[PDB]
Structures are given as structure tokens and as C-alpha cells.
Structure 1
């Protein structure tokens, strides 16, 4: 069982996503195997983008990974190991799986991309560890930043709130 609507305590990335995922195994009558869960974890991550997507990648369940992840979530899931009892123990081993606050977007939603000055934009790109060896004006940066945004978007060190 699970509560259905519990608080995303401990790890909100490593909870809700995998918990929603587990349901999609159960509901659809999917065989819980290392093999089959790995595959579904890849495809289930198609709709997701952002924290979850980073998570997927850390779990090898992405197209940009060679998959093949064993005891790391996949194995316990294959032996009915509900999502709420995995990340809680994972924190004591690794926290990169949980501290995925580097969302699908930066607070570019909070800032106007046209009021800006190239310098600001440079801070943004530096915040996403990139280097524009080909860039010109702020408008150029904006155009570029907008497409690179969901790929990096290293959100400021705070919560969603």
C-alpha cells in the first residue's frame, strides 16, 4: 500500500516520480523484473523533464545512458520495494539522486529575457557551466539560452518555493 497522497519528504524527486512509476507497473500489469523495469523506467521518463529526467539518467533509464543499473532502485523495485523505502536509505549512500533541484527550468520565468543585459546572461550561462565561444548580443544569448535552458537550467539554490 501507499498513502496515495503523502508528503514528498526526504527526497521529493526521488519519491513522487518513482512512486507514480511503480503504480504504472502495477496498473498496467507489468512484470517487475530488472529487465522490464529498466525499460519502462526509460519510457516512463518520456513525459518527464527536469528533476525527474535527471533522476532517470542517474538511474540509467535514459536514451543518453547505456542503462544497466542493478541494485540502485531497479533491483529493490523488482522484489516489491515500494518507492517510499528506497530513497530514504539511498540518502545515506548517495544524495545526488535526491538533491536534484536543478529543475526543468531556471527562474527564467521570473526574469524578463528582453530587459536583460548580456552580462546578466553571461552569469546565466556560467551558472550552466557553458562557454559561448560563439555569441554576440544579449538577443543572441536569449535565443540560445532559451533552447539550452531545459537541458541545463541550474535553478538557483532554493526550493521550488
Structure 2
């Protein structure tokens, strides 16, 4: 399960957009993703940074995430795209605790 944290989070995000009847336009996807990333902690907050969706993150990367989302690119494929930048995105694991 390469990219598993990333894949599940993006699928959760997709499902939220669908369930809330949100338009898949670029600006909307961008704001919604930044919003979805707001209350995140730990590994999910690190993922949000790798997605371009935290204050200290790269909007260049945010564009690389939200443009594929506008055509409903499968989450695994978005994650695999980002892995080529910084591979740690696909290596994340939640605390074993």
C-alpha cells in the first residue's frame, strides 16, 4: 500500500465534495482543500503541507494537486505524481501507539 495515507485522505476529500454538492472548479477545489486541511494534526498536517494546502506550503504544489482534481484524477495517481517531488508524502504512517 504505497501512498496509502495520501490516497485515503484525498478520497475522503473527494467524497466530502460529492456529498456536499460542491462544484469541481479550480478556485473552489483549492479553497475547499485548504479548508479541509485546516484542523489537521500530526501526519495529516504533514500531508496537507505536501499537498500545498497549509500556510507555509507551496501554491505551485497546490496547483499540481487541484488541477488533476478538476478532472477527478484517481487519488492514487495524484499521490504518485507528488511522490516524484518529495517521496516522503507516500511514506507517511500514523503513530503505531
> Considering the TM-score relative to the shorter chain, is it more than 0.5?
yes
CA distance in 2, matches of 1:10, 1:23: 21
Q: Which has the larger radius of gyration?
A: 1
The alpha-carbon distance between structure 1 residues 90 and 57, as it changes in their structure 2 partners (threshold 3 A), is closer
What is the TM-score with the length of structure 2 in the denominator?
A: 0.77
What is the TM-score with the length of structure 1 in the denominator?
A: 0.50
Check the 8 A contact 1:34/1:70 in 2, yes or no: no
After TM superposition, which residue ranges in structure 1, 4 or more long, deviate above 4 angstroms?
none
CA distance in 1, matches of 2:66, 2:28: 10
With a CA cutoff of 8 Å and minimum separation of 6, indicate the structure with the bigger relative contact order: 2
Cα displacement (A) at 1:101: 4.2
Q: Whose helix fraction is larger, Structure 1's or Structure 2's? A: 2
The alpha-carbon distance between structure 1 residues 91 and 62, as it changes in their structure 2 partners (threshold 3 A), is closer
Cα displacement (A) at 1:76: 0.7
The number of aligned residues is: 96
Provide the aligned C-alpha RMSD in A.
Answer: 2.5
Q: Does 1:14 align with 2:10?
A: no
Cα displacement (A) at 1:86: 2.3
CA distance in 2, matches of 1:59, 1:93: 11
Cα displacement (A) at 1:68: 4.8
